[PDB]
Design a protein around this ligand. Structure first.
Ligand SMILES: *[C@@H]1O[C@H](CO)[C@@H](O[C@@H]2O[C@H](CO)[C@@H](O)[C@H](O)[C@H]2NC(C)=O)[C@H](O)[C@H]1NC(C)=O
Ligand SMILES: *[C@@H]1O[C@H](CO)[C@@H](O)[C@H](O)[C@H]1NC(C)=O
Ligand SMILES: *[C@@H]1O[C@H](CO)[C@@H](O)[C@H](O)[C@H]1NC(C)=O
Ligand SMILES: *[C@@H]1O[C@H](CO)[C@@H](O)[C@H](O)[C@H]1NC(C)=O
Ligand SMILES: *[C@@H]1O[C@H](CO)[C@@H](O)[C@H](O)[C@H]1NC(C)=O
Lengths: 182, 91
């Protein structure tokens, strides 16, 4: 029913440049240019939209809604790092501060009467690291139950081991279903 | 529920220009210009639209459908000369 996509804006991202000689017959090297942010540089920005492809038609406009990160993340540079569809009316977005020692999972519900995707502090779950970064490379993906009322996801436990915790979609405490020094 | 509206494009309509002198204190006269189509001239074009106000929200696009006229009319230059709502789901 819906098609979600992310928009990336690299307007202010510095360009890295290098020569590409190509085939011998090419008389002048071409210069490759890629918006590529290096450490501390200006980063691309992102936007997330949910298109309601049901309205799509030649002489009709695109009906879409923009889901923005939760305040705790909006305050500064962030990255959208995960998108998981829970149900036709529930989508989970996982953001993280440019710092990467703080991420949040925002679970949004579709409002049939207004067409927008609503968020709430009940459905927001924080994950962090005080000794490093979240996830092994990126924060782990949540895994929803078929009704999307709870989900399973990997996080570090009190002992510093990545195990499966169980989260109630609208409750902040989780329970570990695995444990051990592995 | 809905908010129908027409959009008018005068882009290719010539301009009638005349002087407006205004109050005595106005040192130079002001040139008034109106996109005014005189006989046989390029007329402004029109687009009709119905907007579903229910999905109106700052972080949301506008939901609107453009109602084009029947082909017998779409064929060439035309005018929209009437808009009558019958029911909430019929215009
Ligand atoms: C108003 O009408 C003009 C045409 O009179 C539109 O201008 C055209 O715009 C398209 C796409 O933007 C171009 O490919 C054409 O070359 C333009 N035509 C000319 C001769 O200007 C204009 O887009 C219309 N404005 C709106 C918002 O509907
Ligand atoms: C991209 O970002 C620039 C600011 O860096 C802004 O002016 C521009 O409108 C943005 N483009 C879009 C289409 O969002
Ligand atoms: C869409 O509008 C164009 C002209 O603006 C017309 O050729 C076509 O028949 C219309 N189709 C629909 C969706 O009614
Ligand atoms: C995340 O990193 C920033 C700067 O590196 C630091 O100020 C902040 O305390 C860190 N968060 C945690 C939980 O340590
Ligand atoms: C979009 O709505 C959200 C509500 O979650 C709000 O926090 C955000 O500032 C809005 N963005 C704008 C100004 O379009």
């Amino acid at each position: 029913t819906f098609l979600a996509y992310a928009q990336f804006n690299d307007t202010e991202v510095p360009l890295i440049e290098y020569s590409f000689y190509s085939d011998e017959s090419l008389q002048y090297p071409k210069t490759v240019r890629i918006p590529y942010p290096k450490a501390g540089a200006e980063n691309p920005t992102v936007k997330f939209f949910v298109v309601d492809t049901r309205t799509l038609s030649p002489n009709a406009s695109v009906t879409s809604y923009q889901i923005v990160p939760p305040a705790s993340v909006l305050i500064g540079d962030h990255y959208l790092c995960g998108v998981t569809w829970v149900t036709e009316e529930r989508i989970s977005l996982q953001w993280i501060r440019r710092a990467q020692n703080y991420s949040i999972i925002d679970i949004c519900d579709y409002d049939e009467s207004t067409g927008r995707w609503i968020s709430s502090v009940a459905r927001q779950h924080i994950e962090i690291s005080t000794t490093g970064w979240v996830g092994r490379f990126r924060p782990a993906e949540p895994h929803f139950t078929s009704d999307g009322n709870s989900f399973y996801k990997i996080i570090s436990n009190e002992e510093g081991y990545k195990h499966i915790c169980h989260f109630q979609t609208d409750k902040s405490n989780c329970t570990f279903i695995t444990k051990g020094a592995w």
